[PDB]
Every structure is written in structure tokens, then in C-alpha cells.
Amino acid sequence: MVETEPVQGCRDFPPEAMRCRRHLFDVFHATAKTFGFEEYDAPVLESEELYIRKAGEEITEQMFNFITKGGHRVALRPEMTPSLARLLLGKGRSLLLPAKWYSIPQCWRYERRREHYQWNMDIVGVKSVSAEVELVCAACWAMRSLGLSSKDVGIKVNSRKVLQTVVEQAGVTSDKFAPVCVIVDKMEKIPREEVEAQLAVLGLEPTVVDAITTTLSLKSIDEIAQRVGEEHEAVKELRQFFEQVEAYGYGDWVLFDASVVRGLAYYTGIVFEGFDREGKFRALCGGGRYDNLLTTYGSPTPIPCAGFGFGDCVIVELLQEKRLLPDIPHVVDDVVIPFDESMRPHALAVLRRLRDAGRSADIILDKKKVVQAFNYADRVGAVRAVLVAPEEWERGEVQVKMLRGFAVPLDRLV
Amino acid sequence: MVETEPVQGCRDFPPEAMRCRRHLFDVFHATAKTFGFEEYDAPVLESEELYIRKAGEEITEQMFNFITKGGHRVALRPEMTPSLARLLLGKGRSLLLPAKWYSIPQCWRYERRREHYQWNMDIVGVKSVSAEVELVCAACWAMRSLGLSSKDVGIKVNSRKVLQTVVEQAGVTSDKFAPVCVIVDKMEKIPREEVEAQLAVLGLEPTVVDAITTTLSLKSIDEIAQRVGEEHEAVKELRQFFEQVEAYGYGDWVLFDASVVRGLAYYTGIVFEGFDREGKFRALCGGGRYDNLLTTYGSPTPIPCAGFGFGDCVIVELLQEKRLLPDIPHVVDDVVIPFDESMRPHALAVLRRLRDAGRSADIILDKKKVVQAFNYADRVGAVRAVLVAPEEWERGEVQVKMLRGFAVPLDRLV
Ligand SMILES: *CCC(=O)Nc1ccc2c(O)cccc2c1
Ligand SMILES: *CCC(=O)Nc1ccc2c(O)cccc2c1
Ligand SMILES: N[C@@H](Cc1c[nH]c[nH+]1)C(=O)O
Ligand SMILES: N[C@@H](Cc1c[nH]c[nH+]1)C(=O)O
């Protein structure tokens, strides 16, 4: 016997499971179309150098990499954003801006699952918070389309610029700001003692550490304004963001949370993440603005960007908990049934007619009795059974039976 | 500057190219639905042992493999059929038969492209030639749906059972039959001298070699019948196959060709391949019956199977040659244009309304003048521009302009 289990940490999607995945992806595609985003894709295999950021990111640490026979260092992508930037950079100033690009790549890791699909949505060339507004509204729209409400989920929002100021003002070199965000990102998950210890190892003293902890636990935007003024660029941007989301009609879906930083080095501005309001699951999605990445890739001119990723695993757990993923059985419009094998040529002509009319149709393929053919029709979820028998055929007719029998002229079948 | 080119032999699909790929995939999906096939998928990463067939197959020789950090021997799949069989085997006798499964996996090789997408269609649990009939009709239907006709393309058909008999009758052990098919598969591509030399290296003498060459060049089914009788199972099956395809209405698309064997070890019966009738391209698609594979994987009971693969590269070259892949520019229903920034909140409310009605819509995101917003609307392929200005808004109206302006009440927009 060959090994029937898939490779470690990887999923099979036989038809039943594939229908569930399609239910999800259909929503990602449909939301992207609704919001005017354009699809793209890139190879699952990228150069490892693409991901060397040196900020202690979990994503870059857990990289599924290997060496080709040719000696080239490659990885199965841990995320899509670097691939997106490569594409954008490759287009040069022929790229028309603003650009709104989406994809649903399988991404990988090695440490538990080693693969997941991740809906990616990115707006490129837009400096203002309107980009983040649209992105967050798109994530809410996807969740609403799956049957969830603002009672089930929300999106927590913050800006890294608040922390940027505190870190700069405390005398810390800005090369440590990204590593700091990575550490601070672990705040909720591990003990405060341990997070402070990690900040200590970076070469930051207790005073600096205190200033960071205090700002992360500020519970409102007015309180941020007290620490940094009402006209600190982050205050205006957040307020603008909330005003715009409210005008769009998703005000009940979003809220401020000063503890949201995200785990990736490249975010520079607004950051956000989706969560379930029962506090049972990990983040549903996550993103933010990353205005410097393209500059760090060698873009001659800075290109503002913002986007998010939205994984396939947590959302499904949530939807299952809420009873929003019932199995949808397979369906087919018609099952054509030869009365016997001598009727097969005629039944094939009928099959052609039905498909020509845009219907989905099967024909009984092997030899079986009429009753078993009706049972098969039921099992495959046929709406209609079309029996092709000698006597009806002589009359220019077939027998039609709605499954969820009467003689009908061929032409009236469709 | 980071490297903008993708990894060697791999394609990027920015929006323009992705639209072309979607045009193709939409056809594969739509054909599969028309023919009652169900989608599945499996991991791109499979155990290398899955592909060790030892028949000198090009497909297994050019395997993109590597070793995980954990020491496990894996490959990026060279083809899908072994993954399909693994899935089928895993289901046991809970799998309901007949099963008709399809997928569009990216498959890989290492030697020129190193990746391609390949539409796979397989019928499982069907012993009779009706399976091959449906599969071939499905491939013709996909090609017709892309704009091709039986004047452009055909499908060449044969059965390996003819050759099986000749090889058996000549005293050759049946363990050499598969390696022989692999060699004979190269007949058209390399010199007859070289093919005979390869057969010689396997330990077959000139007499045996002659018997094979003669049968491959027989130009009709009557001639096959002379070599092996009219009632040799292969004769009845082929005739049944052609009668059924003719009754379905695709008789002009298909023909007999005794030189078609295919390059894979596992085919046991009918084999086929698509070709362009100008003789300019490689095979468009290829498949056949493989009734023993599941037995060789350790299935306790034999499971008949048949299917094909249909790559994304050759078909596109053909469609390009025929002028059947014009660029389809991006479109969007509405572009909502704030008259100025003070109108942004109202324009967002309008944007929500439009999307709520099922329309695809953008809003101008950054700050720009109305004329530039109309230019952007034109560039993104907007059908309609919706201008949100103060004076119309006071009247409960917006301005609508069909792009391929008049005041309209909000409610009448949709
Ligand atoms: C539901 C559990 C979860 O989401 N799993 C998960 C998270 C992140 C991943 C990355 O980044 C890569 C591959 C697979 C996963 C899986
Ligand atoms: C159009 C050229 C062609 O079809 N290229 C091609 C053939 C076969 C492949 C396999 O089997 C794996 C990966 C990539 C290709 C590409
Ligand atoms: N790549 C990020 C999500 C993202 C997309 N665009 C910007 N951010 C992640 O994996 O979490
Ligand atoms: N796997 C075959 C095609 C096929 C699918 N099913 C049966 N045959 C190929 O790569 O050519």
C-alpha cells in the first residue's frame, strides 16, 4: 500500500472539502470585484533573499526553504507582500496608480499546518487613510458575505506612528523600532516580564520600556492625543479613518486598540486586525500601511502601500462555531438515462442538446438497470432525470422526471 | 535593487496576464460543470516515492525534488494523477462510483518553463469506453468554448492493447511493455534508428522491433483488425468509441492514429491526444485509460480509471496564432467622484449603496480634481461616473455620466 496521508502539515481537498474552500474563495473573489480590485499571481517559489529582513519576525524565522539542484537558495513563499512588491517594482513607472491588486496564494511555513491559503488585498499609490478605510471595509464585507455580523466580529485599529514617536523621543535609534514592534506584538500572548526581557536584550533600558508599555495600554484616541497632542499626524489620521468608515456604514465593525501593532517589520502607519467578539480565536485577518517597503527594495521614488492578509483557517473555525458552513451537497441539472444500451446513441444526442443549452448534465456511463440509474441520479443531486426509452424516442420524445415521469418532445427539454 | 525577475522558469501573472489565465480557467471550470465533474485539490508537495515508476518516463526523470530539513524526500508534483489515486485510495469503499473529478493544479519539472497549469479530468469506476468518450468530448468542448473548431484542432485516438498483444505474442515479458511504450512514444520526435537502438538496449531483438514499427504505422482500424481480428477487444472498443463520439456530435473532431501511445507507463487501454491541424505545435492535451494504477498502489480491488491532462502553454500559443486571445481590458461598473474632500463622507455613502446593489464600484481615494478623476475613471474602464457635488446632494441627488452628466435621485442610481 502507498501512503494515503498527504505530506506532513498539508491538506487534501477531496470534493466535499473543496466545495467548502470554494464557498470561501467565491466570497474573496466576489468582494474583490465589488471593491474594484484586480487579480494577480506569482510563483510559490521565490528567492530566499526576498525575505531576509533581520527583524526577528516569526514569518521569516519559520521559512520553508531549500536549495535547488542548481545551488540557488529558494523558499515556498511565507507571505505574498514581497512578491507583490517585486511585481510592482518590475513594472517601473509604466504601472498606473492607484493600483488595487488581490490574490489568494497558498503560503507556507516550517516549524501544526505548514500551508494555508491567504486572501491578499493591497492598495498601491494612495497616501491618504482612504486606502486603509477601503481595505477594512472590504474585510468587513467579506465577513458579512459569509454570514457574520458586527455582533460576531470586529476590526481593531491603531497606528504605529504613536509608538514611533515614543521610541524616537526616548533616544532609541530607529533601526531598533521594527524589532521592537515584533517584540511588542507578542505582548498579549506571553508574560509582560518576558516581553520586557526581550526589549532588554535589544539594549533598551527600563525607562524606555515603561514608555512603550504605557502607550500600548491607552484605551482611547483622546488619551493618545494627551500623550502626543490632538494634531500629531497619527491623531488626525485615525480620526479621519473612523469618520470615513462610519460614513460608509461599518462604524459598528471597527474600534481603536492601542495594543495592535502586528508582527511584520514593514508597517509604518495604520495597522489593523480582525477578531471574534467572544475572544475564542486568533486574529481573523491583519494588515496595515507599509510606505517604505518599495524604497527598501530599491524603488527610486517612494510608493505608499497598504493592504491585508486574510487566512483560510481561523475564519473557517469561526464559521463552523457559528454554524455558517453547512455542507452543500453536489448538484447537477440533468441525469440522462439510456433505457438500455441500444438507446445510448440517442441518449448521447440528448446529452449534447442539454449541455448546448447551458445545462449541467451527466449520462449513465456503465451498464445498469433503470432503478439503479435513478438511485445514482439521486446520489449525485440531479434536479431532473431524463429517461431515453425506445417507444418515446419513436415519437420524438423522452421521459422527464423532476426529482426535487412525463413524455416531452425533444425540443421542449430546454 | 532587489531582483525583479521571478525564479528561473517560473511565471509572474500581473493583472493583464492574470485576465488571460482566468479566461482559460473559466473555460476549464465551466466545461467541468457542464460535464458533471467535481473539483478537488491536493498539496503541490508530495512524497517522492509516489512517483518512482522505473519506466524511463520523461515525467519522472525531470522531477523537481528536494529534501526537507526533516530529511523527508519530497517533490513539487510533476503531474496530478498519482495525487488523485492517493486521494481515491484513502477514501476506501466509502468512495461512491462512478466518480468524475477535476482540478487545475500547477505542476512542476526541472531539466524552458519549470511550471505549468494543467487541467485534469478523470472518470473513476467506469469500465466501458463511455468514459473515454466523455473525456474526449469534454476536451473538444473546452476547445470549442475557447473559439476553436474541428477545422483548427482534432483528437487522435488509439488503444495500447493492440501493441500489448504484439509484444506478448513476440515472447517479450510484460514488465518491458511499459518501458517499450515510453520508447515508442518518442517515434515521431527522434530518428527511427535511435528508437530501434533504444528498444535494442532493453534486450529486444530486430524481429520484435519490426513487429512494433509495423503496427504503429497502420493507418486504419480495418488494418488493425487484419493484424488481430475484428473481434480483438481493442477493435470492438475503438469502434464503440467512434460510434459514441459520432452520436454525441463530435465525429469531425476525432480520428484513429495507430502511432499514438503517450509517454506515461500507466496507460492500459485507449489513449488520445489533441493536436492542431496545421502541424505547428506540440500536443494540446493527452490522456487515456489506466485500469491498473490503483492496484499497483495497493488497492485490494481493481478500480478502472481514465482521464486527461490539458496544459496551459500550448493552447495559449495556438489561441494566439488564431487571434482568439485579444486583451480584455479591466472594467468596473461605477467610479464615485467626490466633488471635493468635503463631499467624501457623502460619496462613501453612495459607494456603499452601489456595492449593496451588487455593482462593482471604486471611489476616488486620493485628492484630485474632477477632470483627473474622470480620466482615472476612463483608464480603469468604468461604465459610469457618479459625481457627488454639494448642490445636487442638497437636492437628494448625484450626477451620473455614462462613459461608454445628469442629476439623478439617490434611490434611482440602482
Ligand atoms: C487556524 C490555524 C492557523 O491559522 N494556521 C496557520 C497560520 C499561519 C500560517 C502561515 O503563516 C503559513 C502556513 C500555514 C499557516 C497556518
Ligand atoms: C508550451 C510549452 C510547454 O507546454 N511547456 C511545458 C510542458 C510540460 C511541463 C511540465 O510537464 C511541467 C512543468 C512545465 C511544463 C511546461
Ligand atoms: N503579508 C501580511 C499581510 C499583508 C498584505 N499586505 C500588507 N500586509 C501578512 O502575512 O500578515
Ligand atoms: N497525468 C497525465 C494526464 C492524465 C490525467 N489522467 C490520466 N492521465 C499527464 O500528465 O500527461
Instruction: Read off the C-alpha cell for B354.
Output: 452601489
The DSSP bridge partners found for residue B270 are B159
As to burial, measured by CB atoms within 10 angstroms (0-12 exposed, 13-18 middle, 19+ buried), residue B285 is: buried
Residue A275: name the closest of A247, A302, A255, A292 by CA. A255
The DSSP bridge partners found for residue A255 are A156
Q: Residues A388, A338: contact at Cβ < 8 Å?
A: yes
Q: Residues B136, A348: contact at Cβ < 8 Å?
A: no
Positive or negative, the CA dihedral A107, A143, B329, B39 is: positive
Instruction: Report CB contact under 8 Å: B86, A352.
Output: no
* Distances A100 to A36, A90, B45 between C-alpha atoms, Å: 7, 16, 31
Q: Residues A35, A141: contact at Cβ < 8 Å?
A: yes
Question: Count of alpha carbons within 13 Å of A256, Cβ hemisphere only?
Answer: 23
Q: How far is CA B84 from the centre of its chain?
A: 15
Sequence letter at residue A255: L
| Distance separating alpha carbons of residues A368 and A17, to the nearest angstrom | 29
Give contacts of B 71-100 with A, CB under 8 A: 72, 74, 76, 85-87, 89-91, 96, 98, 100
| Distance separating alpha carbons of residues B105 and B116, to the nearest angstrom | 8
- Indicate the pairing of strand B332-338 with strand B361-363: parallel
Helix (H, G, I), strand (E, B) or coil at A281: coil
The DSSP bridge partners found for residue A273 are A156, A286
Per-residue exposure over B336-361, b if at least 16 CB sit within 10 Å of its own CB, e if not: bbbbeeebbebbbbbbbbbbeeebbb
- Among B51, B59, B81, the mutation site with the greatest number of ligand 4 atoms within 8 A of its Cβ is B81
| Distance separating alpha carbons of residues A239 and A262, to the nearest angstrom | 20
* CB count in 10 Å sphere of residue B290: 24
Instruction: Read off the C-alpha cell for B340.
Output: 471635493
Cα angle vertex A252, ends A248, A256, to 5°?
100
The rounded Å distance from CA B311 to ligand 2 centre is: 7
The DSSP bridge partners found for residue B311 are B118
Residue of B13, B133, B249 lying closest to A41 (CB–CB): B13
**DSSP per position, A333-385:** EEEEEESSGGGHHHHHHHHHHHHHTT--EEE--S---HHHHHHHHHHTTEEEE
Tell whether B201 is within 8 A of chain A (Cβ).
Answer: no
**DSSP per position, A168-212:** HHTT--GGGHHHHHHHHTTTTTS-HHHHHHHHHHTT--HHHHHHH
Which chain B residues are Cβ-neighbours of A100 within 8 angstroms?
362
Tell whether A201 is within 8 A of chain B (Cβ).
Answer: no
Tell whether A255 is within 8 A of chain B (Cβ).
Answer: no
The DSSP bridge partners found for residue B384 are B334, B402
Return the H-helix or E-strand segment holding A319.
helix A314-321
The rounded Å distance from CA B59 to ligand 2 centre is: 10
Instruction: Read off the C-alpha cell for B389.
Output: 457635488
The DSSP bridge partners found for residue A46 are A75
Residue A71: name the closest of A44, A47, A42, A43 by CA. A47
Tell whether B134 is within 8 A of chain A (Cβ).
Answer: yes
With a 6 Å cutoff on the Cβ, whether B152 touches ligand 4 is: no
Instruction: Read off the C-alpha cell for B297.
Output: 498502489
Q: Residues B152, B144: contact at Cβ < 8 Å?
A: no
Instruction: Read off the C-alpha cell for B302.
Output: 481493481
| Distance separating alpha carbons of residues B393 and B413, to the nearest angstrom | 13
- The domain segmentation of chain A, as residue ranges, is 1-324, 325-414
In this structure, what are the phi and psi dihedrals at residue A209, rounded to the nearest 5 degrees?
-60, -45
Residue B85: name the closest of A12, A329, A10, A22 by CA. A12
Place of cell 527522434: B190
Tell whether A339 is within 8 A of chain B (Cβ).
Answer: no
Q: Residues A390, B107: contact at Cβ < 8 Å?
A: no
Sequence letter at residue B196: E
Which chain B residues are Cβ-neighbours of A1 within 8 angstroms?
89, 297-298
Return the H-helix or E-strand segment holding A157.
strand A153-159
Tell whether A106 is within 8 A of chain B (Cβ).
Answer: yes
Place of cell 477632470: B371
Sequence letter at residue A259: S
Mutate to test the interface with B, among A1, A2, A114 (most CBs of B within 10 A): A2
Tell whether B367 is within 8 A of chain A (Cβ).
Answer: yes
Q: In what order do the strands lie in the sheet with B332-338?
A: B361-363, B332-338, B382-388, B397-402, B406-409
Q: Residues A267, A306: contact at Cβ < 8 Å?
A: no
Return the H-helix or E-strand segment holding A408.
strand A406-409
Place of cell 510608493: A303
In this structure, what are the phi and psi dihedrals at residue A39, rounded to the nearest 5 degrees?
-75, 145
Positive or negative, the CA dihedral B350, B353, B359, B363 is: positive
Q: Report the C-alpha dihedral over residues B139, B142, B148, B154, rounded to 10 degrees.
A: 0
Residue of B14, B40, B72 lying closest to A18 (CB–CB): B40
Instruction: Read off the C-alpha cell for A250.
Output: 461599518
The DSSP bridge partners found for residue B231 are none
Q: Residues A70, A62: contact at Cβ < 8 Å?
A: no
| Distance separating alpha carbons of residues A204 and B113, to the nearest angstrom | 50
DSSP state, A53?
-
Residue A256: name the closest of A278, A277, A273 by CA. A273
Q: Residues B125, B102: contact at Cβ < 8 Å?
A: no
Helix (H, G, I), strand (E, B) or coil at A265: coil
Place of cell 524606555: A208
Q: How many residues does chain B have?
A: 414
SS3 for chain B, per residue? CCCCCCCCCCCCECHHHHHHHHHHHHHHHHHHHHCCCEECECCCEEEHHHHCCCCCCHHHHCCEEEECCCCCEEEECCCCHHHHHHHHHHHHHHCCCCEEEEECCEEECCCCCCEEEEEEEEEECCCCCHHHHHHHHHHHHHHHHCCCCCCCEEEEEEEHHHHHHHHHHCCCCHHHHHHHHHHHCCCCCCCHHHHHHHHHHCCCCHHHHHHHHHHHCCCCHHHHHHHHCCCCHHHHHHHHHHHHHHHHCCHHHEEECCCCCCCCCCCCCEEEEEEECCCCCCCCEEEEECCCHHHHCCCCCCCCEEEEEEECCHHHHHHHHCCCCCCCCCCEEEEEEECCHHHHHHHHHHHHHHHHCCCCEEECCCCCCHHHHHHHHHHCCEEEEEEECHHHHHCCEEEEEECCCEEEEHHHHC
Rg over CA atoms, chain A: 28
Phi-psi map region of A53: left, alpha, beta (phi>0 left; psi -120 to 50 alpha)? alpha
Q: Residues A349, B249: contact at Cβ < 8 Å?
A: yes
| Distance separating alpha carbons of residues B291 and A8, to the nearest angstrom | 29
As to burial, measured by CB atoms within 10 angstroms (0-12 exposed, 13-18 middle, 19+ buried), residue A100 is: buried
The bound ligand whose nearest atom lies closest to the alpha carbon of A285 is 3
- No. of helices (H) and no. of strands (E), chain A: 15, 17
In this structure, what are the phi and psi dihedrals at residue A294, rounded to the nearest 5 degrees?
-65, -35
Instruction: Read off the C-alpha cell for B86.
Output: 492517493
- Among B120, B155, B260, the mutation site with the greatest number of ligand 4 atoms within 8 A of its Cβ is B120
* CB count in 10 Å sphere of residue A51: 17
Q: For chain A, give percent helix, strand, coil, nearest 5.
A: 40, 20, 35
| Distance separating alpha carbons of residues B149 and B278, to the nearest angstrom | 13
The rounded Å distance from CA A131 to ligand 3 centre is: 15
Q: Report the C-alpha dihedral over residues A395, A399, A400, A406, rounded to 10 degrees.
A: 80
The rounded Å distance from CA A50 to ligand 4 centre is: 34
Ligand 3 nearest-atom number relative to CA A120: 5
Helix (H, G, I), strand (E, B) or coil at A72: coil
Residue B398: name the closest of B383, B412, B411, B410 by CA. B410
Residues 6+ apart with CB under 8 A from B223: none
| Distance separating alpha carbons of residues A17 and A334, to the nearest angstrom | 24
Positive or negative, the CA dihedral A238, A244, A247, A252 is: negative
Residues 6+ apart with CB under 8 A from A152: A143, A276, A277, A318, A322
* Distances B190 to A80, B8, B186, B197, B370 between C-alpha atoms, Å: 43, 28, 6, 11, 65
Positive or negative, the CA dihedral A50, A53, A59, A62 is: positive
| Distance separating alpha carbons of residues A183 and B134, to the nearest angstrom | 58
Q: Residues A405, A390: contact at Cβ < 8 Å?
A: no
Return the H-helix or E-strand segment holding A144.
helix A130-145
Rounded to 10°, the helix B233-248/B221-228 angle is: 160
Q: Residues A185, A194: contact at Cβ < 8 Å?
A: no
Positive or negative, the CA dihedral B63, B67, B73, B79 is: negative
Residues 6+ apart with CB under 8 A from A12: A6, B41, B42, B43, B87, B90
Place of cell 486571445: B325
| Distance separating alpha carbons of residues B152 and B175, to the nearest angstrom | 39
Q: Residues B239, B155: contact at Cβ < 8 Å?
A: no
As to burial, measured by CB atoms within 10 angstroms (0-12 exposed, 13-18 middle, 19+ buried), residue A299 is: middle
* Distances A349 to A344, A354, A411, B91 between C-alpha atoms, Å: 9, 9, 12, 34
User: What's the gap in Å between the CA of B362 and the closest CA on chain A?
Assistant: 6
Place of cell 500547477: B106
The rounded Å distance from CA A11 to ligand 1 centre is: 12
Ligand 3 nearest-atom number relative to CA A286: 11
What's the N-to-C CA distance of chain B in angstroms?
47
Instruction: Report CB contact under 8 Å: B248, A349.
Output: yes
Sequence letter at residue B333: D
The bound ligand whose nearest atom lies closest to the alpha carbon of A77 is 1
Instruction: Report CB contact under 8 Å: B345, A244.
Output: yes
Return the H-helix or E-strand segment holding A305.
strand A305-311
Approach to solving? X-ray
Instruction: Read off the C-alpha cell for A168.
Output: 524616537
Instruction: Read off the C-alpha cell for A328.
Output: 452543500
Residue A276: name the closest of A368, A150, A390 by CA. A150
Residue B336: name the closest of B319, B360, B358, B316 by CA. B360
Rounded to 10°, the helix A192-201/A206-216 angle is: 130
Data resolution in angstroms: 2.0
Total CB pairs under 8 A between chain A and B: 230
Residue A86: name the closest of B4, B6, B15, B14 by CA. B4
Q: Please tell me which residue of chain A has the smallest CA distance to B18.
A: A40
| Distance separating alpha carbons of residues A143 and A276, to the nearest angstrom | 11
Residue A309: name the closest of A159, A142, A169, A174 by CA. A142
Instruction: Read off the C-alpha cell for B7.
Output: 525564479
| Distance separating alpha carbons of residues B333 and A145, to the nearest angstrom | 20
Q: Residues B123, B138: contact at Cβ < 8 Å?
A: no
The rounded Å distance from CA A48 to ligand 2 centre is: 25
* Distances B46 to B11, B59, B66, B77, B108 between C-alpha atoms, Å: 22, 15, 11, 6, 12
Q: Residues B61, B99: contact at Cβ < 8 Å?
A: no
What's the N-to-C CA distance of chain A in angstroms?
47
Which chain A residues are Cβ-neighbours of B352 within 8 angstroms?
248-249
Mutate to test the interface with A, among B1, B44, B48, B305 (most CBs of A within 10 A): B44
| Distance separating alpha carbons of residues A124 and A131, to the nearest angstrom | 8
CATH of B1-324, one of 3.40.50.300, 1.10.10.10, 3.30.930.10, 3.30.365.10: 3.30.930.10
Positive or negative, the CA dihedral A312, A318, A324, A327 is: positive
Helix (H, G, I), strand (E, B) or coil at A222: helix
Q: How many residues does chain A have?
A: 414
| Distance separating alpha carbons of residues B387 and A408, to the nearest angstrom | 54
The bound ligand whose nearest atom lies closest to the alpha carbon of A80 is 3
Check if CATH label 3.40.50.1970 holds for domain A325-414: no
List, chain by chain if needed, residues with CB within 6 Å of any ligand 2 atom.
B 107-109, 113-116, 311, 313-314, 317
Residues 6+ apart with CB under 8 A from B182: B55, B56, B57, B58, B263, B264, B265
Q: Residues A368, A376: contact at Cβ < 8 Å?
A: yes
Residue A255: name the closest of A294, A206, A203, A220 by CA. A220
Positive or negative, the CA dihedral A31, A37, A39, A42 is: negative
Sequence letter at residue A20: C
